[PDB]
Amino acid sequence: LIGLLLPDMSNPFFTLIARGVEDVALAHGYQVLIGNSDNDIKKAQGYLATFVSHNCTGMISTAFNENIIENTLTDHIPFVFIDRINHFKGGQLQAEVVRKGKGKNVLIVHENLLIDAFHQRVQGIKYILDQDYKMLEATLLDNDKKFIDLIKELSIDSIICSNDLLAINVLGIVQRYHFKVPAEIQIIGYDNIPFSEMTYPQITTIDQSAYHLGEIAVSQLLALTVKHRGSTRHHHHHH
Amino acid sequence: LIGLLLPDMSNPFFTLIARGVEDVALAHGYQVLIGNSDNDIKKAQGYLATFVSHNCTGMISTAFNENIIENTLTDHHIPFVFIDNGISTNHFKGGQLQAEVVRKGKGKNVLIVHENLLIDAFHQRVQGIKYILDQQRIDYKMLEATLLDNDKKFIDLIKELSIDSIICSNDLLAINVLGIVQRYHFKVPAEIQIIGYDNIPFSEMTYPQITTIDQSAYHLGEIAVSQLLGALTVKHRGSTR
Amino acid sequence: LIGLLLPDMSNPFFTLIARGVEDVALAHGYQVLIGNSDNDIKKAQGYLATFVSHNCTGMISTAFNENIIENTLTDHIPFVFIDRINHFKGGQLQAEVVRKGKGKNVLIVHENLLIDAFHQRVQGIKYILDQDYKMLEATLLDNDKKFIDLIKELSIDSIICSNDLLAINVLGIVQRYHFKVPAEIQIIGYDNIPFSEMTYPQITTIDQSAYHLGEIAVSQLLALTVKHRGSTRHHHHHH
Amino acid sequence: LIGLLLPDMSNPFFTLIARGVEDVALAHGYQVLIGNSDNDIKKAQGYLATFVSHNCTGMISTAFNENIIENTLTDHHIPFVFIDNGISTNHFKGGQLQAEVVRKGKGKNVLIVHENLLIDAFHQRVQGIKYILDQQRIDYKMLEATLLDNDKKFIDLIKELSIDSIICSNDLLAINVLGIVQRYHFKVPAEIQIIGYDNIPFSEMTYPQITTIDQSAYHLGEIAVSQLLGALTVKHRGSTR
């Protein structure tokens, strides 16, 4: 029996990892206990304690949780960290797409940097870019008027987002304020969740092979490709 | 321990229910185990056994597997609620609401793009739509959402049938459809209006935003754990006329 | 102007650090912006963003926050980590008091191991002890009946707690169920907050020089001693 | 930005107010800056300036510095609430409640161990106690809480005066007092009963637990930010007769 502690069950990237895990597991007669930590230390600790209570044979989680997972190994249970089966290189790829699209003034819209995968990605972006940008915490998208005002004041022509969910949110704000994507503002996400193929234009993104990540993770227990699409400055239209 | 068996955890309608469930559950000292049935009876059967094995004090799921759930759980004296022992808003009434928005938008040729009608919620919603459209003598055709996968063939059909209105079983279908028609240079909503269901956050992120029906998903989660232990609103938005 | 991001403003250990900081700062005409992150990544990010908004000259925080603090240094602000001005050694000292009191069956009641200071301390305990114990997450104290049942089943004679707040809670539970502290059960805390001297018996603890920590922290910006008291098995009574 | 100026953030009564303040504030999109005045006018004056400098949309503090606050803030058109423009429960009534618990416990020789009477809350509470004890012709003496620092001298006084009841300005004083008398082998409550104020969590952690007065501290924090933007209960416990 496997315990799978997901950082954000409302993120399709993680639900897809989870299906890769559940599929392989169920094939080999294994059950999975699934928990959502919401990157909350109290929730993480809660679920992990319970998964121990219930004699899990192995655990899958992200490295937000290493201290507890480690202690639970010694005190009791092998583990795999899904985020460690490279995010810095991913970030470099995002910045290189922006450069290939002739970006001059770039906004890095990021999820919480206390999450290593996000932080490492933003380090990769900065590397290529430092070789003009501003950083903006994802929560600031909530005031769309002030977001658009920033875009104008800074003459932003490129936006790099930590994942596809943020890219999609960003796309709808700038389109609702009448900017042209990609000619005026180009946008790049990460993960390649199916939502990324549903927008007009479709979101240029980095495929992390989520389903295959879950598959490998559970297999250990028992590479990145750019998707160039309409949202960046090759493909013109679909007719 | 509360066993939550979701039909599709990739759908944000269900993970929002799950949030509801989690928040009330923790406020009362419970944890929630999640299963994704992935719309599969074997998988569902697996989680029932998982949840039963691990001494869950109650189960929350949809009625898709009501027979095996009822039978296994009653035997073990474990209560259960079905979120679609019921607690849901009325899906027939929701479908009427979808069709009324279309009527108001002056819909003449309506494509009903639907999820699996094996699922009671989806099927009832469709009868809701047909109830209104038949009375109105508005023409409609029904298309299963898989046939969305080839987008050029979808467009051929839209053109041939002169579709001006599309009613979707949920917001994932509506959103997908929106991207397709926009990509083939249809104007939304003047040429084609589209309506979804669920009011997931993605529905407010598209341009135009997707007109939908909020069915109090978070609170559905809250009620289920409340019933377990002891409202429909049209969101009028840019995608409709 | 200093930003001081406290992990838990309801912990007297941190409020005392804060006074050391505020005192030295105010002496040198410096203001302090004080924020409570509650070790919540969203709160931490919120406060740190704001402290940046408001042109802080330097920041003081714990290493829960390193990724954001670091990024804010490069993008903008020097920092000091209060938890890094040794916790593993502290843990060894707690275990050595227990051994000196002839502990046989030990309960390690711990705060959240996702917090490095707590985790490192518990590693220090395990080191000495491994050279019989059970670990118990602090949240489990809430069911006092089951806590006392565990104490009985396991014949617990020693309890090591991550800090004085937990030690004090533990003391009142076992005393209300009629156990004799220290003859039947001995208890050790950490930090040496003033509450530790208020109980009967007084709580044996490890002084971290909290006020002096705050003083040093702000000074950088511009050792452990056992307190043997009544709660462990030298001093007999106060008459 | 909301400026919260606490008189003593080492006191859990105030950090609980602060939690109240933080939770409502964030729910509405605000952050809270905290200042500890450390019971000091220079420090308080510093934070007013800090909070004013940094364009706080409102201030929350105690009325200790009401004159300089009122004057500086009114000039800058910044509103403010005083948690002890007031929002508090009544401290005089709280003191009556303390003395009634003692009367019921058959108190005959009462020591009133008090915080700084410069602080209105503390002084009013003391008049509350004296109101009841005078009517009852119960004897009492007043002791400032600093003279708690030498515990053998405190005990000498307790013995000389045959004290059987101790009313404390807050739970930090009560708790300290409890440890002192217990350490010198007085039996609580049969020999000496003790009552505090505030109902901080430490009051439920001692043995015996400390009888106190809950003054809705968390909710005090909530109301203050609500007033800013737009109940007393005896807890009867083992430490009293």
DSSP letters, B148-167, are: GSSHHHHHHHHHHTT--EEE
Residue of A nearest to C44 (CA): A114
C67 and C91 together in one domain: no
Phi, psi of B4 (to 5 degrees): -110, 120
Residue of A nearest to C119 (CA): A67
State the best of B28, B183, B185 to mutate against chain A, taking most chain A CBs within 10 Å. Answer: B183
Assess whether the previous peptide bond of A182 is cis (omega < 30° from 0). yes
Determine contact: C44 vs chain A, CB below 8 A. Answer: yes
Chain A, 48 to 87: residues with Cβ < 8 Å from chain C are 49, 64-65, 67-68, 71, 74-75
How close C26 comes to chain A (CA, Å)? 31
C64 and C122 together in one domain: no
Provide the b/e sequence for B8-38 (b: ≥16 CB within 10 Å): bbbbbbbbbbbbbbbebbbeeebbbbbbbbb
Distance, in Å, from the CA atom of B75 to the CA atom of C7, rounded to the nearest integer, reads 49
- The residue count of chain A comes to 239
Residue of A nearest to B53 (CA): A54
D221 and D241 together in one domain: no
**Nearest C-alpha neighbor of C181 from the set D199, D240, D174, D182:** D182
B144 and B102 together in one domain: yes
Q: How far apart, in Å, are the Cα atoms of A70 and each of A63, A77, C72, C163, C236?
A: 10, 9, 30, 21, 41
Inspect the interface and report whether the beta carbons of A54 and B50 lie closer than 8 Å: no
Distance, in Å, from the CA atom of A44 to the CA atom of C54, rounded to the nearest integer, reads 33
Per CB-CB distance under 8 Å, the chain C contacts of D10 are: 12, 15-16, 19, 194
Check: CB of residue C143 under 8 Å from CB of residue C136: no
Distance, in Å, from the CA atom of D134 to the CA atom of D132, rounded to the nearest integer, reads 6
Rounded to the nearest 5 degrees, what angle is found at the Cα of D166, between the Cα atoms of D160 and D170?
Answer: 140
Inspect the interface and report whether the beta carbons of D31 and C46 lie closer than 8 Å: yes
How close A89 comes to chain B (CA, Å)? 27
**Nearest C-alpha neighbor of B50 from the set C75, A34, A225:** A34
B172 and B98 together in one domain: yes
Structure tokens at A129: 């870019």
Inspect the interface and report whether the beta carbons of C42 and A68 lie closer than 8 Å: no
Q: Which of D179, D185, D209 comes nearest C199 by C-beta?
A: D179
Inspect the interface and report whether the beta carbons of B33 and A36 lie closer than 8 Å: no
Determine contact: C110 vs chain A, CB below 8 A. Answer: no
Distance, in Å, from the CA atom of B166 to the CA atom of C98, rounded to the nearest integer, reads 73
Touching partners of D (3+ C-beta pairs < 8 Å): C
Residues paired with A187 in a beta bridge = A159
D96 and D63 together in one domain: no
B213 Ramachandran zone, left/alpha/beta (phi>0; psi -120 to 50) = beta
How close A127 comes to chain B (CA, Å)? 31
Determine contact: C101 vs chain D, CB below 8 A. Answer: no
Q: In CATH, what number is assigned to the domain containing residue A44?
A: 3.40.50.2300
- The residue count of chain B comes to 241
Neighbouring C-alpha atoms within 13 Å toward the C-beta of D144 = 5
Per CB-CB distance under 8 Å, the chain B contacts of A171 are: 205, 207
Check: CB of residue C138 under 8 Å from CB of residue C162: yes
How close A110 comes to chain C (CA, Å)? 12
Inspect the interface and report whether the beta carbons of A9 and B9 lie closer than 8 Å: yes
Structure tokens at C19: 């006074």
B220 and B158 together in one domain: no
C98 and C69 together in one domain: no
Inspect the interface and report whether the beta carbons of A36 and B18 lie closer than 8 Å: yes
Per CB-CB distance under 8 Å, the chain A contacts of B175 are: 195, 198
Residue of A nearest to B54 (CA): A54
**Which residue, chain included where needed, has tokens 């620092």?**
D149
Do D and B have ≥3 inter-chain CB pairs under 8 A? no
Domain extent for B219: 1-88+215-230
Determine contact: A125 vs chain C, CB below 8 A. Answer: no
How close D95 comes to chain C (CA, Å)? 24
Distance, in Å, from the CA atom of C131 to the CA atom of C127, rounded to the nearest integer, reads 6
Assess whether the previous peptide bond of A78 is cis (omega < 30° from 0). no
How close C129 comes to chain D (CA, Å)? 28
Distance, in Å, from the CA atom of A111 to the CA atom of A119, rounded to the nearest integer, reads 9
Inspect the interface and report whether the beta carbons of C67 and A114 lie closer than 8 Å: yes
DSSP one-letter code for A203: P
Phi, psi of C186 (to 5 degrees): -100, 150
Gyration radius (Cα) of chain D, Å: 19
User: How many angstroms from the chain centroid is the CA of residue D241?
Assistant: 23
Q: What is the DSSP string of B59-126?
A: EEE-GGGHHHHHHHHHHTT--EEE---B-PPPHHHHHHHHHHHHHHTT-SEEEEEE--TTSHHHHHHH
Residue of D nearest to C49 (CA): D31
Distance, in Å, from the CA atom of A103 to the CA atom of A133, rounded to the nearest integer, reads 10
Q: Preceding residues of all breaks in chain C (C to N beyond 2.5 angstroms)?
A: 76, 85, 131, 222, 233
Inspect the interface and report whether the beta carbons of C12 and D16 lie closer than 8 Å: no
Chain D, 156 to 185: residues with Cβ < 8 Å from chain C are 175-176, 178-179, 182-185
Resolution (A): 2.0
Residue of C nearest to D26 (CA): C43
Check: CB of residue B202 under 8 Å from CB of residue B229: no
B84 and B55 together in one domain: yes
How close D197 comes to chain C (CA, Å)? 17
How many domains, in total, are found in chain D? 2
**Nearest C-alpha neighbor of C199 from the set C163, C230, C239, C178:** C230
Residues paired with A186 in a beta bridge = A158
D203 and D97 together in one domain: yes
Size of interface A-B (CB pairs under 8 A): 87
Q: Which of C18, C172, C198 comes nearest D207 by C-beta?
A: C172
D55 and D119 together in one domain: no
C68 and C130 together in one domain: no
Q: Which of C33, C168, C176 comes nearest D33 by C-beta?
A: C33
Determine contact: B97 vs chain A, CB below 8 A. Answer: no
State the best of C15, C144, C161 to mutate against chain D, taking most chain D CBs within 10 Å. Answer: C15
| The A158-161 sheet, strands edge to edge | A133-137, A106-110, A158-161, A186-188
Distance, in Å, from the CA atom of C16 to the CA atom of A111, rounded to the nearest integer, reads 33
Check: CB of residue B154 under 8 Å from CB of residue B147: yes
Provide the b/e sequence for B105-139 (b: ≥16 CB within 10 Å): bebebbbbbbbeeebbbbbbbbebbbebbeeeebe
Per CB-CB distance under 8 Å, the chain A contacts of B38 are: 19, 22
Structure tokens at C75: 């993008």
Q: How far apart, in Å, are the Cα atoms of C205 and each of C117, C161, D163, D226?
A: 16, 10, 32, 41
Determine contact: D40 vs chain C, CB below 8 A. Answer: no
Inspect the interface and report whether the beta carbons of D50 and C35 lie closer than 8 Å: no
Determination technique for this PDB entry?
Answer: X-ray
Structure tokens at C93: 């000292």
Per CB-CB distance under 8 Å, the chain D contacts of C237 are: 183
**Nearest C-alpha neighbor of B109 from the set B144, B137, B128:** B137
Inspect the interface and report whether the beta carbons of C239 and D34 lie closer than 8 Å: no
- Could you give the residue ranges of the DSSP H alpha helices within C77-182? 87-100, 116-130, 144-154, 164-176
